[PDB]
Amino acid sequence: KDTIALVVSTLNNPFFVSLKDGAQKEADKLGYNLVVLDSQNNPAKELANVQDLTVRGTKILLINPTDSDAVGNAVKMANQANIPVITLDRQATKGEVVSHIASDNVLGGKIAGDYIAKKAGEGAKVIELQGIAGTSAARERGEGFQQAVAAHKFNVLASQPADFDRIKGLNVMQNLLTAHPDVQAVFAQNDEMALGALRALQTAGKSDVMVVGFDGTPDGEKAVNDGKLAATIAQLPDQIGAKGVETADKVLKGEKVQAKYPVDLKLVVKQ
Numbered sequence: 671k672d673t674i675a676l677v678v679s680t681l682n683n684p685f686f687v688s689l690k691d692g693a694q695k696e697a698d699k700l701g702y703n704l705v706v707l708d709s710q711n712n713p714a715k716e717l718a719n720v721q722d723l724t725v726r727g728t729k730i731l732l733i734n735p736t737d738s739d740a741v742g743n744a745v746k747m748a749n750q751a752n753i754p755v756i757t758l759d760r761q762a763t764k765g766e767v768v769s770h771i772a773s774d775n776v777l778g779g780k781i782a783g784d785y786i787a788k789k790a791g792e793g794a795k796v797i798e799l800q801g802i803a804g805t806s807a808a809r810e811r812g813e814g815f816q817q818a819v820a821a822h823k824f825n826v827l828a829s830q831p832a833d834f835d836r837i838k839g840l841n842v843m844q845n846l847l848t849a850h851p852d853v854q855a856v857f858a859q860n861d862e863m864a865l866g867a868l869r870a871l872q873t874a875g876k877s878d879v880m881v882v883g884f885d886g887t888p889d890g891e892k893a894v895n896d897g898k899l900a901a902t903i904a905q906l907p908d909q910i911g912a913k914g915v916e917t918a919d920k921v922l923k924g925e926k927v928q929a930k931y932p933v934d935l936k937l938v939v940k941q
């Protein structure tokens with residue numbers, strides 16, 4: 671059996687658990703052996719992971735970068751070892767990559783902002799909880815959101831990273847709340863940060879603030895259904911993982927593939 675490796679940025683996020691499951695299901699279907707390694711949001715750990723795999727008989731590397739710019743060295747190592755690289759969800763700024771599979775994050779950010787404008791109104795006072803700086807995903811969602819900002823004349827009270835993490839999201843929101851009690855809406859660049867922000871609002875007795883997340887994870891969708899989260903932009907993590915293994919199969923089979931494969935987004939609201 672050929673071995674495909676999946677190096678994921680972290681497993682402490684339901685989104686990446688789903689991405690891993692999607693890849694696992696497809697590997698099983700296509701008869702591949704899937705090795706999963708966790709970089710734990712650490713570029714140093716990611717590099718060590720890739721160095722390790724290059725001598726394990728790995729046929730293809732599926733990588734979800736911890737950082738789009740820092741991952742370059744790891745990609746170049748796979749390149750030297752003649753192991754084809756396919757990036758999933760986040761881009762690699764440097765190094766040779768055969769294919770990239772991800773959502774349109776610029777569109778996602780604009781769509782989230784447009785929905786805020788539709789509910790809280792034009793000129794609304796907003797806070798943005800950004801993802802990990804250095805990732806294409808955070809960068810693109812910010813750009814998209816900025817389009818909605820200019821379009822809807824939003825007043826951005828504060829924008830700050832909470833690293834796609836639920837606990838950091840809670841703490842950052844708690845601190846921002848004390849300095850900006852007049853916030854009307856929050857765009858959280860992923861559901862984990864959105865759920866943390868909701869807990870901060872809960873602790874603070876602020877039920878009047880509209881929160882929009884991103885991912886459509888099981889927890890994210892439940893909160894929308896329970897009326898706590900106003901909306902989330904659903905991605906298809908499982909399909910990103912499956913598409914990665916499928917593309918890996920073609921490459922190994924000598925079939926040529928597209929350099930970029932888009933996966934659809936969907937706005938999710940209650941009802």
Ligand SMILES: O[C@@H]1[C@H](O)[C@H](O)CO[C@H]1O
Binds near residue numbers: 859860862
């Ligand atoms: O697209 C993914 C998901 O939003 C995840 O929750 C954080 O990392 C991003 O790159």
